[model samples]
Target chain A: TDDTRATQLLSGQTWADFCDTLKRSGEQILRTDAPDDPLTRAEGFRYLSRLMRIALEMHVEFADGAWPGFFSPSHETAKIGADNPDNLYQYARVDGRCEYRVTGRRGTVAYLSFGTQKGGYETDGKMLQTGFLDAKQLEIAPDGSVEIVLSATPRAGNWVRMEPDTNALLVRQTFLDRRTETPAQLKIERIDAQARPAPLDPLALQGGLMRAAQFVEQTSKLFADWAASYRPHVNALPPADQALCQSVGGDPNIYYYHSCWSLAADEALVIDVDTVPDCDFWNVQLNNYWMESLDYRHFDICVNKHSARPNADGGVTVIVAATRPGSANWLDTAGHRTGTICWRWVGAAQPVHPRTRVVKLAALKEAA
Target chain B: RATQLLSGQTWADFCDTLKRSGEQILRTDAPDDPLTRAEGFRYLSRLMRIALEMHVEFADGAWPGFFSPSHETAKIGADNPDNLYQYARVDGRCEYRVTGRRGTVAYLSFGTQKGGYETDGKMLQTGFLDAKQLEIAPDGSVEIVLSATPRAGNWVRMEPDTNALLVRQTFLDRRTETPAQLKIERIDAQARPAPLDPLALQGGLMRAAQFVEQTSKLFADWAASYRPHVNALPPADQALCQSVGGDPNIYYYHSCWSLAADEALVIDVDTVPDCDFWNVQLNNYWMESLDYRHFDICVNKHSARPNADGGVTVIVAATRPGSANWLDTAGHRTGTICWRWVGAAQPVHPRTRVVKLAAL
Candidate 1:
């Protein structure tokens, strides 16, 4: 098998195979049950390209554990698994046997946390958490700086636990108001890396390219399966399976709701929260059927804790419609008739189930 | 045609084009060494990353965003290790503005191009501006207007066919300098872009794939041409260089180098010219600059020490040399090397010779 893979790499068979795998991934977009509209089809193909970008980053650009680098796993252009619009996610590959020190400036953000995980989309399609640390427990210096020591053995002063199986570190930074809030500046390095990396090994290139292609295939399938499962509860917000979420690298301190919705031009889906719970942060975001956060730069597709105004009774109301609604929180559809929605409550003691109802847009405006 | 693209036929063709690009690496002229073979394939992968960003991620003219066309990892076209190249897609018909804070970087220039490698393999410069021509506010902020018509303040002119903006930030000493912070926004544009278009995606995908193939072939051909003049630093054809997006402000020299572990290649410039910047760098056979982060693979004017007669001598070897200008091979027996003279009034050629490491 070693000879086979090496020969494949040296003879250019691996490159051809990688390209073939990418071509095959297009089948996910052609599923019979999925939407066949022009917008959906276009976005679906774009979604595959986005997945390729993320896959290359995950398995090629940042693959080496000796020289770790942080890259956004989900951002403006590429996304997956209902990425949070109000949160910034950064990831880096690592070797658990080696020690790492994460240094950063503790900027004024709503929430900041670091998590280390084992497994990957290329293997078991799971990111089981091995270590966790949050800003609340981190030690800040007089200069508003912080340093985190990550190792298998716990160390004094701002330590994160890592096991020998841990392979990656994830950093989540949440912002209530991106315009006013600042994000922490961070970097990571191995405690004792070589002065310079050796010339790239051909075998490693073979493995990295193979894993990258597989990642594009497996991740597309995993999220497609999740999207299909939400069809039964279309137009209703239901609590997602928490254990299932955690198995795929979801935050432990959050409660999630995942579902699909469809609305006509003259109708609106009203999401009402009866009581606002005491929580660190909460938000509702609109996503495409592929679970990508919509164009947040152009539309108000996301409403968060700070941006949403509560009613007199300390309740929140969000209206999902195409046009401006006479309400507090308006999640713009931005030219979509059918897609997914996500709601998250972070660091909350009580998880409140939100009620949803559909009403005629003109009738609701007339009542108001 | 829309049906073909929407049904994923275009994506398959894109992949097939990418697969064909691999043949450029296995050419007969290329070395069969493992290092050369490995880096050659890696070069194709790097080209793919850049092509995707150029044609897929930031291809839209309505919303322009800067992405590094060359960086510490993904590189192309003998990328300058001391230079940071930021590129953004733009439409010549639409006016845009660039706002930035002028940091302490040594050199900064902006150029707009009218063509792409995927099409004509030519990025002819439509307009150019350097830091000396820029007007900076008292607070160290600068604003540049880009349009076909000239403006009162700092302006970069473009033709009707201009489609891209390239910014080059060069550092004399990277350890102590900071790059400028820049942002680009189209003027008088709408608030948002329309939903993804099937035709646009199809065109973008095709161009991206073609870019990967064409760019690989272009550089591979250049590398093969250097085989005849091995171990000799000769001036490159200036016209040929500019036709393929080489900076107009610089003169270039390229060659192939092959030496044993105990040998050193010594380059001597008898009289250093008065120029804004000059440097030499070592690259692999694929024309990718060697890793400059950890190794002394390059020596620039700011870091090089001149001889008593005002000439400069650089030594390239695997082991450490007791010399002022030492370019480390970083464990390689054969590779390519490049030299540059930036903003020189008159070009002066450099002399090269190989010698025993014991004699150096």
Candidate 2:
């Protein structure tokens, strides 16, 4: 098999195969259930491009597990499944047989967590969590620096567990107010690293190319399937299958709500969360049919707890519309008639389901 | 053409083009060793990553955004490991402003460019501005306007054909120095950018593919042409260098070097010229600068110590040369080297000699 892949690599068959898979991934955007409007279709193709970038970085540039290095799996320009608008995400490959240390200067972010997982989206779409660590449990040094250990056996100080199958570490940093918050500076390396890396192994590059292509295709299909499932619950925010979410690496501290919406030029989707539960953080965001968050840079497509307005009854309300609803709780659609939606309750003791309603833009009385 | 992108035909063709370009990596003049072959393929991937950014993500001249063409992972034409590079797409016809905090970096410069590798294969410099010409506020904040004609305050002249802006921030010691925090924007913004359409996506994808193929071949040709000058350093063609997007203020020398286990390539300059910046760097066969993060691959005006006669001499060796100007070969015995004399009134040429390591 090594010789075969090596021959493919040397003969350039690997690259052609890689591109062919990428070309086939476009089929996900052209599925029967997908929206064929110009905006949705164009974004769908662009989504493929974004996935290509992320996959290459994941499977090639930072693929070495023995000498781990951090790279963002998602960012402002390149995104994946409902990537949080108020978060900084970093990821690195790992090996369970080897021990590693993560060093960081803890900054002022509101929330931070590290998770080790055993699977990936390219394979079975199951990123089952193996071990987890939170910043609150960390013991910081005098200079704001911290060290963490990763091994099968627990250690005296900070430690993240690993099973024989553990393969990756994902770090998530959430911001309450991005303008005022600072992200931690972090570094990760194997405890027993080699002096220098060996020359690139053609076999490794060949395998990485194959896996990268699989990642693009598999990730696209998984998220597109998620979007298709939301069609039946249009304009209604329902609690997503918790186990399914966990299977795909959802944060253990957060409960999720996922649904879809379609509004006319004169319609608005209003969401109400009565008797808001006490929590560490929460947010509501909108995404296109392709599950890409609407442009948060230039529009208010996402609303977090710090930016949300409160009613006298200790509740919250948000309105999604094409035009300004003349209200403070506006989530601009940014030119879309159909798309998906997400709501998250972080660290809440009990899950609180949000209520949704669709009404004409000129609807009844003001609740205030 | 638009339909092709929508129907997925263009993507298939783009892939085929990339597949065909692998021939450039297997050129007869290039090394067939495992390490060289492996790095060549990796270099192609790196070029693809850079090309996608240059043509797709930040290509919109109206809503310009900055992206690094070379960094720790992805590299370009002998990228300087000691400098932080920031590039953005801009329209010369439009007015813009760059605002930043002038940090403690040793050197900083801003220039407007007119060409790219995907097009005429030239990087013509159209405008120039540096830290010496910049005005900083009392609190370390700085602002400069970019336009075709000079304005009242700090301004960089952009020609009507200017399409890019490149910012270079050099450091003496990377660990101890800080780089300028910067931002860019057009003077008068219209409505928010429209959604990505088929036409734009098709154009970006096509040009990005062209960039990957064209860039690999261009540098491969540069490397092949240097075969006759192996083991010697000679002045590079200045006009050709400038056309290929080098800085106008700099003179360049380029050559390939080969050495035995116990030999060294000693570079000598008659006199160190007065200049704003000067340096020499080692690169792999693909002209990707050697890894400077963990190796001694580059030495500059500030880092290099001159001789008693005001001349400069540096030795490249595989082992410890036990001298001040010694640069490690970093596990390499054959590779390309670059020398630059930036902003010199009259450039001083450099000479080289091959000698036993003990003689140095």
Candidate 3:
């Protein structure tokens, strides 16, 4: 029944703009930090599609204070942050004061950690990290049944204490070798005397709806400011630049930075590098309006010193635009009136400089 | 013509799938918290920026500069983390040679990959070389070869698996030493050309759609997982993720929790017992974070308020409950805890029991 109201509320301009903002996040994928090839970029974009499914579950289904665990953690494919391809992350939120019981058949995964905390994301930023008990703390019965007690106060044993601030519980299951290890199967429930939840309170419902809409607005504004900040500089975004992205607005786990610039016909962004230094990954690419990376196999739109003909003085230069400069490393503009510049350095040791100079295609040739 | 043809019955089918997937937002199987759900919605939006930037800029056949440190838009992958991570793109079909002057960083490596947000099939990885494995010259300079055919001397192997080139530089102490410098270019290209492949265009569009969904759900799940464990010692969540699906190098966190509207959770730890770099951050219900920049939400060993006990005390709560150096929640109900111990000797999982926010 509330779905109707939720839908109606979402129908407002606030919701429409929210969706539009999501569409904008796609721009970050074009950074020089990314692979410009069709196959790789295509796959990267699909990752976003999966995120959509999860996001919907979060906003609409879970927005209510109801207990509905629809999508169980898929250890195989689900991920976030710097997703360790080897760990299984499971989670759920509950009332802090409520008594709960957990039962599980611990699988063969190498490591397991359980924690209970108080506070929901909407109100308390300081989530009380309560009891942290590991496999060493659990009392497994012979029947593969592990009964655990959860409360705000400490109990006898196998007890996970939840402080007055705790409103949720989490399970972190890790594996040393994923190919062989089995993950733990876990579930949680409120063991309080009142099994059924109290009647839905309008105030609670109102609070929840307000927060959902607020997230939409605040989130949209946050990233729009990001796209606006990336317009300057020259050549392909480098790994150093990607590191910069992390500094201003980046997920701590992701080492990423990429941008594509479509230089104006009269302008050529000159990318100059003194020498190659130690680092894991670095590359620059030219892109069109669609933010698609220029073809690297056939063109010079992107270059890593790996394939360039360096100058006699141990330096590299890249010219970006419509005209073809017969210079050492002349990147093709892929036929764009104005383009962006992108550079990326994955796990970079340091940043580099790429200078920009605007001149006619013919002048670019003359200058070369 | 394709657009028009799809507008008829095809449009209805497409809309139906959207509607079907949309229903998952309300499913009971996952988190039902409003903040978590809303964050998911916003997370999808965040990923969209990266996807579009990749497709419209790099995939269009123009090689722009590395990472955008431009005034308006600076991003890590599509966006950057405030931490360490660096990468650059390269072509899989061509041959490339690399030469670099090694720096003093503790860790370094290069890997070639064949997947991006635009293409999500499988990441074909190649050219993995650690510093110890490299043959460095006497002058702190080294040369490595990257090509389709394996080269013998100091060769960095490249396969059809190469989609992007990745560089990893882990720091023991970022403040002390300087990072390295690097340069790259194609061996065979007078002018980069654009190939008009209809299939690529279609593939790009489809991939973009999928990425929006995948990325949104991913972080939401992590934040949700973190929520349940707040207020305790940052549980070894890395282990939990390892069971489900997580790569190694997965460092977990321990944190404190409290519920008093006026009572904040003051986390006091001995001055981050030195080892690898570490960080403490705040997360909201959907398992995302508050505006990290504008709040007292996070503090790493590099930046922390040390206590008289040679430790750090971070306050987490709905609002700055006064007296305690306040970490503004910016209106969060349930918060999360995180501590990272990178490359520690014996990973000392911190102790995290809560004390009253007001008591401080």
Candidate number with the higher DockQ (2 or 3): 2
Q: What is the full ranking by TM-score, best candidate first?
A: 1, 2, 3
**Best model per TM-score:** 1
| 10 residues in a row with least lDDT, candidate 3 chain A | A73-82
Q: Name the regions of candidate 2 deviating beyond 4 angstroms.
A: A364-368, B260-263, B305-310, B324-326, B331-333, B355-360
- The per-model lDDT (C-alpha) reads 0.88, 0.84, 0.49
True contacts kept of each: 0.65, 0.37, 0.05
TM-score of 2: 0.95
- In model 1, what is the error at residue A190, expressed in angstroms? 1.5
Tell me how far the alpha carbon of residue A351 in candidate 1 is from the true structure, in angstroms, after superposition.
0.8
How would you encode candidate 3's per-residue C-alpha lDDT over B1-360 as one tens digit per residue?
233112222222322322333333444534554544554334433444444334333443224223321111122111112344444456666766566677777556666656653345234466566666777789988676667787787666677656555565655456875565555555565543444443444444445545544444443355445445656765565555433222134366633233556656666666455464656666544334455434566556555656676766677776555554455555555555556665465565555555655566
Ten residues in sequence with the least summed lDDT for candidate 1 chain B: B188-197
Identify the candidate with maximal DockQ: 1
What TM-score does each of the candidates earn?
A: 0.97, 0.95, 0.44
What does candidate 2's lDDT look like per residue over A136-227, in tens digits?
A: 68777888887989887778788988988888888999999989999999999989856766546889998888888899899989999999
Report the C-alpha displacement of residue B282, candidate 1, in angstroms.
1.5
Model 1 earns a TM-score of: 0.97
Ranking by DockQ: 1, 2, 3
